[PDB]
Design a protein around this ligand. Sequence first.
Ligand code: 2JL
Ligand code: 2JL
Ligand code: NAG
Ligand code: NAG
Lengths: 132, 82, 412, 408, 384
Amino acid sequence: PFQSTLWLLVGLSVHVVAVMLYLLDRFSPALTLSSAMWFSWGVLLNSGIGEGAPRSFSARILGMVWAGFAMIIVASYTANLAAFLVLDRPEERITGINDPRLRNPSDKFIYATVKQSSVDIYFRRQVELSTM
Amino acid sequence: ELFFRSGFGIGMRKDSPWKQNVSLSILKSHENGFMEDLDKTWVRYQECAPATLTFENMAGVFMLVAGGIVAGIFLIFIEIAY
Amino acid sequence: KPTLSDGTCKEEFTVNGDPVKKVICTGPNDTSPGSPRHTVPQCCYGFCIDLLIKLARTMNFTYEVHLVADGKFGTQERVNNSNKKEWNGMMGELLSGQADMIVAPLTINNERAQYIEFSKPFKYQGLTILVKKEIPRSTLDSFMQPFQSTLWLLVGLSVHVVAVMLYLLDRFSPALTLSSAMWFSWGVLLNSGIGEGAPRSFSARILGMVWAGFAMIIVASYTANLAAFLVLDRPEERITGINDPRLRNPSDKFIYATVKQSSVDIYFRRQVELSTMYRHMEKHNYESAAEAIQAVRDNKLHAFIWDSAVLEFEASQKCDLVTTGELFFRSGFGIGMRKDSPWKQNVSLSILKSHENGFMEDLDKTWVRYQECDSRAPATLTFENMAGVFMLVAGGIVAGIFLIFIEIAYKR
Amino acid sequence: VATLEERPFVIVEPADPISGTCIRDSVPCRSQPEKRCCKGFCIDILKRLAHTIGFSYDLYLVTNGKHGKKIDGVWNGMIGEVFYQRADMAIGSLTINEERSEIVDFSVPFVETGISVMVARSNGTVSPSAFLEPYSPAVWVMMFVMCLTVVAVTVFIFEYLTFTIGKSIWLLWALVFNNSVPVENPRGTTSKIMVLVWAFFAVIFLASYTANLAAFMIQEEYVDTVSGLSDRKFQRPQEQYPPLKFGTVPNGSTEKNIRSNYPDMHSYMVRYNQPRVEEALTQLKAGKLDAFIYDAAVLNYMARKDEGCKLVTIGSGKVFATTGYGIALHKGSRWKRPIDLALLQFLGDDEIEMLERLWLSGICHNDKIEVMSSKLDIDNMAGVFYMLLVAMGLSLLVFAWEHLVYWR
Amino acid sequence: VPCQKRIGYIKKCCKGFCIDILKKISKSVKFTYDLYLVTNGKHGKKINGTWNGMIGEVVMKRAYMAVGSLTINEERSEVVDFSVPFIETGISVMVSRSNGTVSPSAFLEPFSADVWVMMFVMLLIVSAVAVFVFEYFSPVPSFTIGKAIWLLWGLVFNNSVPVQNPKGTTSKIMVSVWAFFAVIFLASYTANLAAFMIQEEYVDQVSGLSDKKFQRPNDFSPPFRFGTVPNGSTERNIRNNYAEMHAYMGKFNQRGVDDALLSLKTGKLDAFIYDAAVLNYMAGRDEGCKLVTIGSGKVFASTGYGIAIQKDSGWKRQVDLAILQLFGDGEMEELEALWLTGICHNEKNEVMSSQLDIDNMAGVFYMLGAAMALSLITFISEHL
Ligand SMILES: O=C(O)[C@@H]1[C@H](C(=O)O)NCCN1C(=O)c1ccc2c(ccc3ccccc32)c1
Ligand SMILES: O=C(O)[C@@H]1[C@H](C(=O)O)NCCN1C(=O)c1ccc2c(ccc3ccccc32)c1
Ligand SMILES: *[C@@H]1O[C@H](CO)[C@@H](O)[C@H](O)[C@H]1NC(C)=O
Ligand SMILES: *[C@@H]1O[C@H](CO)[C@@H](O)[C@H](O)[C@H]1NC(C)=O
């Protein structure tokens, strides 16, 4: 669902948020770059890891919107997987005569019948069906 | 869909005198329920899925779970030493 | 446009600042056919009048545009006097001799080509379908849609059933109080963080576990059903041209209208396959093309079979309308003049010459193809659809208001 | 030519009084007679044969009966108009019959007629075992196995700094099931990181489950029911569930066949004997009835031309005692070969099909071509409740074991 | 239809769109035909003051009619009389199907902006009442406003952060009932967001050949590429009206038309410009369905085909009437679909699986970036 470059960028925004939370909490008038990663990684993966409460006003708002971004990634991933999965019926049913693969010879969708019989008499009757 | 509706037949020459009775007899077998027994005996019998995920299309994620186990052995030693 | 003061056309500018050239048409005002009127100068401008001006700049001839009297394009019909067929509108005005050249959108055909010459077309267009563009609205009620209204009241009892079972399965085995089982059984279902009493026994753990797995499925099935209902259920009443089965048979898709005594009517007459479709709309055809488009915005007529060169202009300006279908009758317009017309050889040549000069492209760029909103249906959840949820949590505040006073009274 | 006025086949309309003469694209059919024209389906067949064969005609509506009948000595109606030298042909809605074949000779049928069955449109179920569907047992079972390995690893990987296996299973299972339960977290970084890796799989597993669960009840169509006339569920309902109610229009061709084959069918079906075709539909549409049985060529047309498309037949090749329509003749009229040759030409070509897209058609499509997703109800997901019901019983089994371990 | 051919007159069989049109005209106006296929040149071109091709033989009075794919112009119209066109023709543009499309800011389509603000304000009031009404007035650190917001906000956005749960029977109920709203809010958001990325469809637009893509090709965008088949009508038409364009097009000459489609099939050429009569037809029967006849209905020189007749011929009047008769009886679309309609003319939905990327979703990180800076304004102000 996500291009390989999206994972790398989303793989560093968690760290970019982590250092920012540590930087903002360290100058608040014990994240120590260890519980910040657990808070940053815990929200994205929906795992109850660590008790890190960013008491700073600046850090808490970042964490408040950090969860919002984490929700979008998981919600979009589910929807893209849902959209991809529902759009996986390429069977391309013939639906009888008047089909794109049948109106003209595709050289790849080979279709034949019994020699002589009635279909050959049927098909040769109409000049319209002389193309295939 | 059935794009050419034309039933079968029992062909005979033009001068054949059997045409009148063959047509009458073949029409009597339709009403009698007889021609609903042959297809019951010869045709109608033997009357024997949005692409489930399956193990395929998901070997990568379970490899990640296995990969964490392997990386852990290479990570426990460093953590203990440090 | 009505003429301004002093009996002259008002001064106006185009998008590029060039003056839009105007002519003084002398025709009826506030026609209302069937009532007495009078001739009055009127202001005309636009595509088919700029191409007229460039025409007068080549053959060096003068003109005085006067609008048609009755207001119909023209159709040879038999008068009440036996079957002496007589034209009407422009064609009547041209054959009689009052008119000499018909420079107006006028589809050419055999019935008109036999009596007059037509010259080469100056624009190629067909006939399409104009219908009201439905705004994308989500037909979603409150959260009662994904699950039947006879399932929530049995899930709720199952929450309590697990709670009483879990407490009974922990107060006897070799812990959690009754209230903790109430919170834990709920807390798994609504995913809330409340509830600190985890199961202790190895028999209460599994009952409180398979319930958790059941909690995910209920929520996951809710999401899947809402996605299934939203994606699948979209308003699909679009018409894919005349080939649509609704048009191909007499059906009450409200009304299909056209303009009386036009080429569309005669096109609907020579085709006996749809003869009764034309007879169907014989009691519904308007007297003018401008009125019918106004009917579509009034939801009295959700169909229109008119020249695609005209509808696409309205589908761009009046962006509440949209065009549908494929052009099923392609035939160019024509600067028609009477048979044995010395201007006929010049006029047709200048129309063909203007095509490659780029001038004929210039006109439709200023008039028809200055472009506007197109858009042209995933509905967005609105407050109306989701008001049910907000009502519940709004009612939760007042439910607790009548519960706090009885909670404090418990101590006394 | 003798003909009868029928709703989809031969429409008779007054001649246009404004123009005096009747409207074009119609034939001047008298009666047996004010001048008057008619149109329809069988009319177009007749006029096409006139151009091909090269013969004129003078239609007149029959005023005796309907499609001919035997009155025990005299043949009346459209057929009688030909058996008595009065009419050379009887083009219309004439069903080929064995009894009619020996008094008049017919042509090659151009429309098929049988004995079909109606039913109300089915809403559609949701595969009541759907919760276990958007996956495979290989993925389902092994993921439980995978956690058992990870839980065993986590306890061992955390020992080298009171977790135990019991809390590791509880913690790991929590993440994979939309974590909301109380959990105990480890302290070592090697175990804490590993849990996150399993937590990432939990997000993917849950996301994949809900994504494919949506697809299961989106690309599923809606038929949900097929029944046949010869089926015992139709044959006799008195030895089964609450009886299925079905009836027809008596005194007709469909009653003759249903009488000769199954005499008990005739006895039972008189309970619901609707004398009007249109009225029977209303009773069927109101839930009073369950199946209306009549000719295919006259019941398919009414199924196609119907608002809401709420009526679908199961006569998709299951028509029983199928005899087509045809053009009656005089049994010696020597027109049979030219008529049959020309009629087979249209059938051999695609001519008759266009006339089928005409009047003998409707906006409603008997094919499903439509998917509906309704409320999950209780039946469509009672399977997931059964899994819980196993746990309540299984927990009680552990409760006894937890009780009897002390005494033994 | 029988046909002749010079060099010796070898008999041959003729059939095609003009032939069947000629057949219909033949019986309608009761005139006969003895088609002899041209040899010198093709179509016609006035070279050295003399006409060759089909036109050249008519003006030498050797033909008296020239059916075929003859494009109506003014150089021919002053030499050979012309009939009413039976098929339109322009100068169209060809672009690829783009292999789908992406929707930027694809994370805010559900929940119309009234929903967010309505929930946001009531999120504050629920936090306000929980710590004021149902806490200060109820039995049993304490529960501040900041902690209440930090909890209820977390529950909506897929609660994973550590929280400080309330204490009290009523406070727990208020938080619990809010958690149910979060479940519906999250479940419906994902479900609705799935709909918006299922019916994404495809976006194609050229706005004709008179736009900046073909009037200022060397704009801020990378140099646009477009070529035609030289020594033809389109080059002659475009070289006069568009003086600057002819110079630019010379860098991407494509000679054979089939060679040009190879460039389109490989992406070497940005767009293909040629006559719309065959370009629509050729893309109709094109294999792979990667070519769309963009610019349809809005072309440069809409001049139709025709049936050239000798100058001042009496048959001219009876030929135009016959052709128009076939138009009124709804016959063109029968043979138009019979001969040149292709198979890739179905609905243009072409819904494709999305491949969400930074291009697909951009504002999602911008909100994080904006909130990253939004913390700074609340970070400096804490000192004051
Ligand atoms: O087969 C039959 O039962 C007869 C006749 C025969 O050969 O006897 N063969 C043909 C069928 N038919 C009838 O009486 C009959 C019964 C009902 C409708 C119509 C014709 C048109 C309708 C339109 C709407 C509703 C009902 C009808 C004819
Ligand atoms: O207008 C032109 O340029 C001429 C001519 C004229 O009167 O000059 N008027 C018509 C256009 N044309 C051509 O030479 C031409 C060039 C290329 C194809 C076709 C016709 C069918 C194809 C099918 C596949 C690929 C190429 C082609 C005609
Ligand atoms: C056809 O059946 C009739 C009825 O019994 C009979 O009289 C006649 O001989 C039969 N024809 C032939 C050729 O057997
Ligand atoms: C038409 O144009 C030609 C050439 O310019 C000219 O000789 C002729 O006089 C024009 N026709 C009329 C009626 O002036």
